Amino acid sequence: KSYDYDLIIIGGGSGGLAAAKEAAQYGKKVMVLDFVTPTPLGTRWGLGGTCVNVGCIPKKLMHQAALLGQALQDSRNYGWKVEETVKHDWDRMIEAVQNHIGSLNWGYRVALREKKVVYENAYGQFIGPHRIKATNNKGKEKIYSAERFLIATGERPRYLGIPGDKEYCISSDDLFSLPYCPGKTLVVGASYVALECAGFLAGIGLDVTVMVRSILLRGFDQDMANKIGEHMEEHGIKFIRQFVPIKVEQIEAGTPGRLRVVAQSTNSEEIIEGEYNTVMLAIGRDACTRKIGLETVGVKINEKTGKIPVTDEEQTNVPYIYAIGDILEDKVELTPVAIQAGRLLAQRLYAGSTVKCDYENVPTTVFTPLEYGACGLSEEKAVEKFGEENIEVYHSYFWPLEWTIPSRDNNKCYAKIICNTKDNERVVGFHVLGPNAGEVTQGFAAALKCGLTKKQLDSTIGIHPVCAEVFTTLSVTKRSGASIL
Amino acid sequence: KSYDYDLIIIGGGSGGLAAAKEAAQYGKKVMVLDFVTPTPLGTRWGLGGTCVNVGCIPKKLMHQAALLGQALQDSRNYGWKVEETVKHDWDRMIEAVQNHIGSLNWGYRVALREKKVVYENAYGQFIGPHRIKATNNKGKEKIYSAERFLIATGERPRYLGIPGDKEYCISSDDLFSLPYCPGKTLVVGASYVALECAGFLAGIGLDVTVMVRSILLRGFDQDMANKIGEHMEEHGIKFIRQFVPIKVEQIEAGTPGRLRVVAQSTNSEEIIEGEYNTVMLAIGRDACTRKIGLETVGVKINEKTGKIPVTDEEQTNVPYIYAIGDILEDKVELTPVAIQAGRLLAQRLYAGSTVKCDYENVPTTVFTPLEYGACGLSEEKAVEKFGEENIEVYHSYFWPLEWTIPSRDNNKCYAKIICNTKDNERVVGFHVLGPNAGEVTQGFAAALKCGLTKKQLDSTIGIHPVCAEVFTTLSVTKRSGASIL
Numbered sequence: 010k011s012y013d014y015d016l017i018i019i020g021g022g023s024g025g026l027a028a029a030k031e032a033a034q035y036g037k038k039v040m041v042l043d044f045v046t047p048t049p050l051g052t053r054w055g056l057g058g059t060c061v062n063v064g065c066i067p068k069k070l071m072h073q074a075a076l077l078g079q080a081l082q083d084s085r086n087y088g089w090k091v092e093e094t095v096k097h098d099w100d101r102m103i104e105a106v107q108n109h110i111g112s113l114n115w116g117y118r119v120a121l122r123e124k125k126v127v128y129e130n131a132y133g134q135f136i137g138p139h140r141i142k143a144t145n146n147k148g149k150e151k152i153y154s155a156e157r158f159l160i161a162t163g164e165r166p167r168y169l170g171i172p173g174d175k176e177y178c179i180s181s182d183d184l185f186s187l188p189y190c191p192g193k194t195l196v197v198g199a200s201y202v203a204l205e206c207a208g209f210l211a212g213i214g215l216d217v218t219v220m221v222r223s224i225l226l227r228g229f230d231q232d233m234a235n236k237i238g239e240h241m242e243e244h245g246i247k248f249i250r251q252f253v254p255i256k257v258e259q260i261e262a263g264t265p266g267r268l269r270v271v272a273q274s275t276n277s278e279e280i281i282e283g284e285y286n287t288v289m290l291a292i293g294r295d296a297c298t299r300k301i302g303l304e305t306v307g308v309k310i311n312e313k314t315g316k317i318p319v320t321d322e323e324q325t326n327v328p329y330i331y332a333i334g335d336i337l338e339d340k341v342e343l344t345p346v347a348i349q350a351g352r353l354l355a356q357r358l359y360a361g362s363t364v365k366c367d368y369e370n371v372p373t374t375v376f377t378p379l380e381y382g383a384c385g386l387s388e389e390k391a392v393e394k395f396g397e398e399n400i401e402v403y404h405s406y407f408w409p410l411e412w413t414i415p416s417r418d419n420n421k422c423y424a425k426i427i428c429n430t431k432d433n434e435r436v437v438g439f440h441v442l443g444p445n446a447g448e449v450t451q452g453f454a455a456a457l458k459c460g461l462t463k464k465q466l467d468s469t470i471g472i473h474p475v476c477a478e479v480f481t482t483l484s485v486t487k488r489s490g491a492s493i494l
Numbered sequence: 495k496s497y498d499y500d501l502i503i504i505g506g507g508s509g510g511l512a513a514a515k516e517a518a519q520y521g522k523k524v525m526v527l528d529f530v531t532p533t534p535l536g537t538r539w540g541l542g543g544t545c546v547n548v549g550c551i552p553k554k555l556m557h558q559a560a561l562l563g564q565a566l567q568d569s570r571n572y573g574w575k576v577e578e579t580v581k582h583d584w585d586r587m588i589e590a591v592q593n594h595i596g597s598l599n600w601g602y603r604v605a606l607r608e609k610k611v612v613y614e615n616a617y618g619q620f621i622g623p624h625r626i627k628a629t630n631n632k633g634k635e636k637i638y639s640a641e642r643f644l645i646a647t648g649e650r651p652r653y654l655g656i657p658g659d660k661e662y663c664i665s666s667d668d669l670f671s672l673p674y675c676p677g678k679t680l681v682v683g684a685s686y687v688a689l690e691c692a693g694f695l696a697g698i699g700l701d702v703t704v705m706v707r708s709i710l711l712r713g714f715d716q717d718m719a720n721k722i723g724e725h726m727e728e729h730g731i732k733f734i735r736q737f738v739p740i741k742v743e744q745i746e747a748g749t750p751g752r753l754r755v756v757a758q759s760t761n762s763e764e765i766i767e768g769e770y771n772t773v774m775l776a777i778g779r780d781a782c783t784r785k786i787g788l789e790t791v792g793v794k795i796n797e798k799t800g801k802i803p804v805t806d807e808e809q810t811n812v813p814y815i816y817a818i819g820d821i822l823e824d825k826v827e828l829t830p831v832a833i834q835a836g837r838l839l840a841q842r843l844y845a846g847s848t849v850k851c852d853y854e855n856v857p858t859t860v861f862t863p864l865e866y867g868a869c870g871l872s873e874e875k876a877v878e879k880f881g882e883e884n885i886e887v888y889h890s891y892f893w894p895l896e897w898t899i900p901s902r903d904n905n906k907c908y909a910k911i912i913c914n915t916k917d918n919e920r921v922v923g924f925h926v927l928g929p930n931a932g933e934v935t936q937g938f939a940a941a942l943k944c945g946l947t948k949k950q951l952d953s954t955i956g957i958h959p960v961c962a963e964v965f966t967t968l969s970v971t972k973r974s975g976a977s978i979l
């Protein structure tokens with residue numbers, strides 16, 4: 010019957026925009042609702058969502074700034090006449106990053122206008138079957154109807170339920186647009202975002218302290234996680250183990266001001282205090298699925314975690330509403346997963362395709378000071394799945410050539426592959442800790458999709474001299490116990 | 495009967511040393527003869543051969559110096575307060591590189607002593623069946639006998655048959671230990687070494703001119719070759735097309751002196767002159783198989799090219815003499831190929847293995863200012879092999895994130911895959927032109943060994959934001975003619 014649009018995408022993040030562009034490619038009427046509720050402090054950003062504005066992109070750019078710091082240090086030994094110590098200007102770096110983010114926001118808006126996709130800067134909210142309520146910034150309300158709906162609502166940073174967090178602490182949301190140098194900083198948490206931000210804040214010369222609850226990088230391989238922790242610690246970052254903040258109180262306002270954080274042990278009553286210029290909370294992310302009125306349409310969600318269960322076709326229990334992105338239950342919360350799922354969903358709905366999104370063996374990279382690229386099973390998970398006796402772990406240290414002249418950081422980089430003997434020594438796991446990890450990891454992920462075997466990998470000819478070539482000649486097993494130095 | 499050693503390896507290059515170490519791993523008596531005939535100028539180097547001393551390693555290090563120059567330039571926009579123009583010191587860079595090369599020479603010598611491998615700094619020469627003559631630096635001669643012989647003699651730079659070349663020009667042999675800044679330089683040739691040296695000499699701020707005979711990078715994909723030429727030309731390198739030097743004459747001696755080069759056109763009698771501080775000859779390499787007495791033992795060689803034909807087991811026409819490395823006929827002249835062939839040959843001879851060296855689809859990287867990584871067939875070769883109508887070329891420009899803030903070099907990087915439709919759109923060719931090319935290329939080479947298909951590649955999930963991810967979403971064909979900007 011009557012239907013304003015054929016597809017309404019709530020949320021203009023990576024996945025949402027990808028699906029919008031693709032569905033528009035097939036002449037369907039599509040409308041995108043994107044609205045960023047401001048941070049407790051008041052920070053807001055444009056179209057594009059978390060990756061573009063507050064995520065993947067600026068984090069990579071600041072990591073590049075840190076890497077260029079290390080390059081400035083390295084250049085001395087290679088013959089460049091650079092002054093011994095170079096200072097870093099936070100304001101300029103922020104200006105450059107924010108300028109590029111603005112350019113990407115504008116690019117996306119132009120792309121949406123070009124593909125004839127209506128963009129409405131309004132907060133979406135279900136009120137009834139096939140109908141939604143959109144509230145603009147000013148407060149004006151409008152109603153829309155659609156045949157199909159795409160929930161692409163994404164997540165927002167989580168806060169500790171402690172006093173002072175919301176008015177005195179900053180999150181990933183605020184850091185990449187912070188209008189002043191954070192000075193000394195306390196990063197709470199051990200998620201990959203926590204280590205990324207800690208690392209590159211340390212690289213630009215600030216004093217950073219990371220406060221962890223139990224373990225580093227839950228979900229990632231713990232051996233590699235421990236190695237990253239060791240390397241970060243040897244670079245000047247300080248770690249306080251087994252502590253959670255219980256109160257944050259402002260000593261003096263400013264830009265930055267001074268704050269006191271009082272925290273309690275996890276296994277005792279021992280209480281320690283510290284003074285920091287700003288405190289960044291990186292302790293996970295919460296789905297924004299509570300406040301979109303899913304009850305008015307009957308979408309079933311996991312009340313405990315907020316995630317929405319979906320079929321292998323991204324379909325909810327309600328036939329005409331589909332969800333993509335991080336909000337999904339037991340999927341992988343990465344931007345290329347969202348984009349691929351959106352593209353394939355659009356092609357399935359309007360292009361007669363049958364290809365589904367494969368969520369298995371998807372690579373990731375943690376951009377710590379020492380990049381960490383991973384694809385496939387962890388060692389622990391592999392042993393769980395196939396049995397200790399059936400898993401052989403080939404590993405080796407290697408020394409990237411570019412670091413020999415600076416004469417630094419030997420026998421730190423680490424490469425290990427986890428192979429299943431029961432299945433022709435198939436390579437079920439791949440982990441690399443070293444420079445340009447993601448570039449090396451992309452190819453071996455594509456190989457894992459092809460069922461790379463240890464024999465073929467051994468037959469592949471390395472390139473010389475390139476870091477990645479360490480993966481050509483892995484011959485030492487952990488089971489053998491031989492040294493790898 | 496009587497046999498001094500079980501295996502005599504003539505030549506202590508990459509392949510020779512690899513085979514020596516591996517054969518020693520199995521308790522066999524092995525002796526290595528390594529001797530570097532000095533350059534016309536008189537430059538000599540230690541153990542390790544061409545890659546270690548005058549090749550892969552120092553070329554990568556100087557490329558890293560150029561890359562750090564570009565990083566120094568980039569760092570300004572990211573917020574580092576670096577002086578506008580920084581000067582480069584040739585002498586310090588040479589000192590650092592040569593120090594690392596010395597360390598590698600010492601490492602190899604120690605490794606050989608540890609594995610109980612006799613190293614004799616003597617020039618090898620066959621005099622009769624299973625017997626060889628070794629002449630030390632001083633001139634003393636010794637005789638040796640062996641059950642098996644491994645010719646690993648490698649190649650040496652080729653010179654134009656023009657007057658003045660040998661006493662006034664330098665080769666790749668001399669450059670990486672040159673005791674003075676080369677100043678303005680003329681690089682003759684278009685082999686990958688020519689472009690590598692030109693590029694990084696330009697990066698450190700020198701005025702470089704490349705003089706080519708007909709085409710760039712013969713053997714490599716010509717489209718990518720032309721793109722590299724264009725990019726190098728837009729970076730300040732000057733190209734003189736269709737010219738070959740006919741005389742080099744010294745204007746004034748010095749360090750550097752001044753030389754005049756007079757050269758003639760290739761298609762006319764037009765003659766042009768130029769003045770340069772040094773002239774580097776990079777016009778190919780000639781096998782050192784003439785002067786080792788192969789006639790006294792009956793080893794058949796290709797008289798025209800100097801290469802030695804071999805079986806797929808690296809065996810010559812004489813059963814007990816095997817050859818590895820670049821000297822082989824119609825093989826691939828790369829260090830990992832030599833090392834892999836040596837390792838597999840040793841395991842076949844003394845470890846009962848049957849695994850052979852695979853010379854198909856071996857990757858390479860040309861470290862031009864813009865790295866070029868390749869694996870598999872060129873476009874031209876693919877069309878020749880399978881037929882134009884059966885080849886689809888997916889390609890795209892991409893813009894590495896790290897360059898957006900410096901705001902330079904957009905729509906220059908280029909990624910293309912060549913797929914065979916007759917064979918499930920199999921990926922028969924892979925070419926990437928962009929930063930960290932080799933790291934991206936290693937993985938896709940390993941995938942090609944697994945028979946990666948266009949469908950699987952499309953199903954692989956990219957990593958974000960990484961350059962390599964461009965290979966996840968290739969959808970534009972050259973046949974379609976659509977724009978890629």
Ligand SMILES: Cc1cc2nc3c(=O)[nH]c(=O)nc-3n(C[C@H](O)[C@H](O)[C@H](O)COP(=O)(O)OP(=O)(O)OC[C@H]3O[C@@H](n4cnc5c(N)ncnc54)[C@H](O)[C@@H]3O)c2cc1C
Nearest residue numbers: 020022023044045058059064133162163334335342343344
């Ligand atoms: C610091 C950081 C670094 C990261 N780095 C990486 C990385 O390197 N690689 C990687 O793969 N992933 C990375 N991620 C994860 C990545 O940001 C997310 O997984 C990804 O953005 C999920 O996409 P999405 O569209 O589902 O969520 P989003 O992109 O956040 O989409 C949600 C959008 O919809 C808006 N919205 C919310 N509620 C409503 C509503 N009711 N109505 C309308 N619009 C609404 C939101 O404001 C937002 O604009 C990082 C995340 C962070 C925080």
Ligand SMILES: Cc1cc2nc3c(=O)[nH]c(=O)nc-3n(C[C@H](O)[C@H](O)[C@H](O)COP(=O)(O)OP(=O)(O)OC[C@H]3O[C@@H](n4cnc5c(N)ncnc54)[C@H](O)[C@@H]3O)c2cc1C
Nearest residue numbers: 505507508529530543544549618647648819820827828829
């Ligand atoms: C500038 C440059 C850059 C290069 N970059 C790369 C790169 O990035 N990647 C790559 O894969 N390849 C690269 N190569 C190619 C690589 O150097 C060769 O392919 C490789 O070294 C071949 O190994 P080989 O042992 O057969 O030759 P060599 O390593 O040269 O072995 C020969 C050794 O034996 C000695 N010898 C010679 N005659 C005798 C004799 N009669 N008796 C005893 N000893 C003798 C020689 O002096 C030398 O020490 C590069 C080459 C050059 C010139």
Ligand SMILES: [Au+]
Nearest residue numbers: 097099190192
């Ligand atoms: Au600062």
Ligand SMILES: [Au+]
Nearest residue numbers: 582584675677
């Ligand atoms: Au110079």
